[PDB]
Amino acid sequence: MIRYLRGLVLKKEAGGFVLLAGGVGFFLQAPTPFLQALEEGKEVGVHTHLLLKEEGLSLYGFPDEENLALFELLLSVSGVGPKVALALLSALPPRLLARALLEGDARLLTSASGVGRRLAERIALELKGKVPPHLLAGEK
Amino acid sequence: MIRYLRGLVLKKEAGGFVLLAGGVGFFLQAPTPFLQALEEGKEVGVHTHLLLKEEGLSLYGFPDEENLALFELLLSVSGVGPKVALALLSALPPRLLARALLEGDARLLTSASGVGRRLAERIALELKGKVPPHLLAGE
Amino acid sequence: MIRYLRGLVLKKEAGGFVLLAGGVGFFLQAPTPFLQALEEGKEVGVHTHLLLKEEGLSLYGFPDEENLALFELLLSVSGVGPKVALALLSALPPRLLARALLEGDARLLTSASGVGRRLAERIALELKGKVPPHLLAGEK
Amino acid sequence: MIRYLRGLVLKKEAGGFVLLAGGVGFFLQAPTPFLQALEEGKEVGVHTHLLLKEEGLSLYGFPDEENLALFELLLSVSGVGPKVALALLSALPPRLLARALLEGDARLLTSASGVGRRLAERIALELKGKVPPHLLAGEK
DNA sequence: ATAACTTCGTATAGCATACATTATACGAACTTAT
DNA sequence: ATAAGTTCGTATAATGTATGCTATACGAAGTTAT
DNA sequence: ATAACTTCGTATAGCATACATTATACGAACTTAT
DNA sequence: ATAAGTTCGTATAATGTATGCTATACGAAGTTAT
Numbered sequence: 001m002i003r004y005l006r007g008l009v010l011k012k013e014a015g016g017f018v019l020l021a022g023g024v025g026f027f028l029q030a031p032t033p034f035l036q037a038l039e040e041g042k043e044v045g046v047h048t049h050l051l052l053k054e055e056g057l058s059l060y061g062f063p064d065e066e067n068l069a070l071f072e073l074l075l076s077v078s079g080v081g082p083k084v085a086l087a088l089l090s091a092l093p094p095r096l097l098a099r100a101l102l103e104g105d106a107r108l109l110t111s112a113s114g115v116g117r118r119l120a121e122r123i124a125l126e127l128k129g130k131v132p133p134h135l136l137a138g139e140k
Numbered sequence: 141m142i143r144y145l146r147g148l149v150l151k152k153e154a155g156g157f158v159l160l161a162g163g164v165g166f167f168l169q170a171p172t173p174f175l176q177a178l179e180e181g182k183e184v185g186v187h188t189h190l191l192l193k194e195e196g197l198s199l200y201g202f203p204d205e206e207n208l209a210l211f212e213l214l215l216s217v218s219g220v221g222p223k224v225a226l227a228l229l230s231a232l233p234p235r236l237l238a239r240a241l242l243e244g245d246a247r248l249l250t251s252a253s254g255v256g257r258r259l260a261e262r263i264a265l266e267l268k269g270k271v272p273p274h275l276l277a278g279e
Numbered sequence: 280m281i282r283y284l285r286g287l288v289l290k291k292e293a294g295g296f297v298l299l300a301g302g303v304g305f306f307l308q309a310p311t312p313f314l315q316a317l318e319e320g321k322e323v324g325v326h327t328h329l330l331l332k333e334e335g336l337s338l339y340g341f342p343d344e345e346n347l348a349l350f351e352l353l354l355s356v357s358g359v360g361p362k363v364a365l366a367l368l369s370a371l372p373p374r375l376l377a378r379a380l381l382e383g384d385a386r387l388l389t390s391a392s393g394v395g396r397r398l399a400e401r402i403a404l405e406l407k408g409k410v411p412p413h414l415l416a417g418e419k
Numbered sequence: 420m421i422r423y424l425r426g427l428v429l430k431k432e433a434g435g436f437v438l439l440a441g442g443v444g445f446f447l448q449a450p451t452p453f454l455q456a457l458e459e460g461k462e463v464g465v466h467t468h469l470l471l472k473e474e475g476l477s478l479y480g481f482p483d484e485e486n487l488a489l490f491e492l493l494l495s496v497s498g499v500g501p502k503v504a505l506a507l508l509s510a511l512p513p514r515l516l517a518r519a520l521l522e523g524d525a526r527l528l529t530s531a532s533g534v535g536r537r538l539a540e541r542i543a544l545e546l547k548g549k550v551p552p553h554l555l556a557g558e559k
Numbered sequence: 560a561t562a563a564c565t566t567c568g569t570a571t572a573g574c575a576t577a578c579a580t581t582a583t584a585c586g587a588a589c590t591t592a593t
Numbered sequence: 594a595t596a597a598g599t600t601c602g603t604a605t606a607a608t609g610t611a612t613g614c615t616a617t618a619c620g621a622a623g624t625t626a627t
Numbered sequence: 628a629t630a631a632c633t634t635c636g637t638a639t640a641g642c643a644t645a646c647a648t649t650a651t652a653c654g655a656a657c658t659t660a661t
Numbered sequence: 662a663t664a665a666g667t668t669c670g671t672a673t674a675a676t677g678t679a680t681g682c683t684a685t686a687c688g689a690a691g692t693t694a695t
Binding site: 022027 | 141142143144145146147161162163166190191192
């Protein structure tokens with residue numbers, strides 16, 4: 001339904017984050033690691049998904065560029081509840097998406113501050129070595 | 141999903157009002173003293189939460205950068221009408237700033253009226269400990 | 280939530296029309312005497328009321344100049360838009376409600392054709408008689 | 420509710436594409452001949468019915484000149500299994516309207532393929548006066 | 560005892576689509592002037 | 594008795610909806626000769 | 628003559644509670660001044 | 662010896678089987694010179 005909304009924001013919350021278009025303001029919670037950066041700007045480039053029933057409407061969050069690969073890999077739709085799907089994903093340590101990734105897939109669902117999800121062979125092949133180019137740093 | 145609309149109002153209704161914006165015409169139900177102080181000459185910073193119940197699909201309003209999360213007090217099984225669905229303020233004690241809502245935990249809002257319920261263990265925990273710069277004024 | 284739509288309209292259909300407010304196009308079904316003459320000419324001040332149904336969702340775009348009292352009077356919790364408040368104006372097409380009301384509020388809403396709507400419409404005496412409106416003609 | 424969307428498109432995907440000119444980014448799934456190498460105009464205009472449910476969170480699109488009658492004629496039972504209906508399954512083969520459904524208003528939907536049952540009496544009334552002479556080649 | 564206050568109590572709200580489209584151009588029988 | 598209105602209760606047409614079978618790479622029959 | 632040349636179509640598992648599994652911050656366990 | 666002290670063990674996020682029904686005009690009590 002919704003992908004890659006841009007909005008506007010100048011605010012950060014410990015468990016929250018919002019997007020403004022000027023007249024309406026969207027609320028989107030992004031994965032915990034990268035919220036320490038990527039706060040101020042005219043665009044945050046967030047992918048979305050949402051629940052439709054029983055008073056639970058709230059857009060989800062994911063990093064800039066394109067990272068729905070993360071959501072597809074870590075959906076866990078089998079009755080996990082909204083308390084997890086919004087934020088508790090990074091089983092990987094991507095700190096800049098170009099510094100710790102592509103290191104022989106050891107930092108690609110192999111060994112990190114996670115639980116050992118025991119899944120691979122899909123994102124790694126799809127990666128096609130696009131990690132290095134022009135991502136050596138982040139953004140404010 | 142939606143939070144912190146903005147704009148200016150031109151109409152006043154006993155049940156609520158509407159917000160002037162591009163596209164659709166946004167409908168907003170807000171507490172009674174808030175709407176009286178929020179005329180066309182005051183900017184309408186509604187911090188909606190969109191409490192939806194079938195036909196009751198409408199936004200809501202609150203004083204700008206204040207009094208938000210009244211849902212923590214007004215959580216209920218089913219809101220029969222707007223008069224319980226966040227169109228309050230006729231009742232709870234403080235007015236014109238919600239300054240007496242905490243008052244440094246000196247007075248609690250539960251026993252000031254017969255419509256509230258005993259929630260002393262939850263009223264105290266609020267940003268009041270940070271001593272916000274809100275003080276008596278025309279706000 | 281939505282009350283006062285504004286946007287672009289250029290089409291006339293036997294079941295209704297469409298409204299373009301940029302980005303999306305809203306589908307609106309005006310009452311029978313309204314759309315039969317008033318279709319296009321500017322960003323029309325067509326009002327709004329949403330509906331819930333199992334086999335159809337749309338808008339109902341009531342006439343301009345604050346005529347939503349019509350839907351408010353004719354709506355029931357068990358009613359359906361295509362069959363209620365939109366099919367209750369045939370055999371009674373007042374060309375202009377301001378003309379039919381000015382100094383004739385009681386007459387038009389009391390002694391007109393029909394024997395069913397009056398029981399509820401008796402409230403509508405005071406709704407429109409506020410100020411002299413600029414409804415001397417239509418639009419095309 | 421929503422009909423005749425329009426916005427910014429720059430991406431081609433095997434399932435569909437996105438539309439994010441203003442506010443959210445709408446996900447659009449065009450039919451097979453359109454999706455087969457019709458992409459990236461200035462702005463694209465697509466119809467829909469907004470058949471959005473809990474499991475399926477996508478909305479569909481169709482050629483930029485009318486053709487919601489195509490969805491009306493293509494309406495199929497949307498089962499649990501994917502790749503059914505979803506704006507796909509275009510029985511007609513045409514490269515474009517004027518290219519391969521001209522020469523009368525019956526040839527467009529007579530003896531096309533498969534079943535081969537004529538259904539002109541329902542559809543021939545709409546595009547007969549607008550298909551020629553434009554729309555001879557695809558838009559890049 | 561009662562007029563004119565002041566003060567305390569009380570102070571909104573009707574309807575079942577118990578499968579989801581209340582219908583536009585014909586025949587029968589009149590009625591007049593054919 | 595029928596030519597020509599007139600009226601009304603006759604009365605639309607197949608519409609179009611609501612928890613689970615589709616894409617793909619393999620055998621193979623038959624080609625052509627004797 | 629055997630071998631060498633057209634056509635050629637089809638082999639992803641889990642649906643049946645939708646409410647118990649996970650970031651942190653106290654603590655026993657270490658070195659050395661009898 | 663040993664207390665303190667190093668580094669790994671500890672610990673929190675729903676009510677769906679569910680939905681129909683508290684609501685601001687004026688009724689009633691009390692004092693004085695009517």
